[PDB]
Amino acid sequence: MKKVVAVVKLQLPAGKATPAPPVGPALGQHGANIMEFVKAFNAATANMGDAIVPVEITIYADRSFTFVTKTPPASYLIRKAAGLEKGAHKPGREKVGRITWEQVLEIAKQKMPDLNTTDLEAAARMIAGSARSMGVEVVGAPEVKDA
């Protein structure tokens, strides 16, 4: 008795969203509420910074909206697997925006269910290589042969 009916696969500006998004009405259907919409957005885009994110508000006719993407494509979750944590008082020696081979795989695997890719190396370079675009980098993916 619950099946998504509207997957708002729209986009949205970080640090720039407001009671006047490219949707507004096109979204007001989940019980009709905008601020909560942008509140959670501006609240996250503000908790992070400014940017753009593809929204995929998986809504179900039962009148519910499940979804929360953060940062442009890839970064939508690559940011998490990347290195966003800040920290407080640590011995030092560390960085931000660092993913791992497998992590980008699963993140790229589900991203390649049967569309057109095939080898984990393609979608991989995507999620991972995409991270490179974002400047992010992998944290492993060993490659040796001299034992």
Curated annotation (Swiss-Prot):
SUPFAM superfamilies: Ribosomal L11/L12e N-terminal domain, Ribosomal protein L11, C-terminal domain. GO terms for biological process: translation. It holds the Pfam family Ribosomal_L11. InterPro entries: Ribosomal_uL11, Ribosomal_uL11_bac-typ, Ribosomal_uL11_C, Ribosomal_uL11_C_sf, Ribosomal_uL11_CS, Ribosomal_uL11_N, Ribosomal_uL11_N_sf. One or more lysine residues are methylated. GO terms for molecular function: large ribosomal subunit rRNA binding; structural constituent of ribosome. Keywords: Methylation, Ribonucleoprotein, Ribosomal protein, RNA-binding, rRNA-binding. GO terms for cellular component: cytosolic large ribosomal subunit. It comes from the Bacteria. SMART domains: RL11 (SM00649). Belongs to the universal ribosomal protein uL11 family. Forms part of the ribosomal stalk which helps the ribosome interact with GTP-bound translation factors. Part of the ribosomal stalk of the 50S ribosomal subunit. Interacts with L10 and the large rRNA to form the base of the stalk. L10 forms an elongated spine to which L12 dimers bind in a sequential fashion forming a multimeric L10(L12)X complex. This is Large ribosomal subunit protein uL11. The gene is rplK.
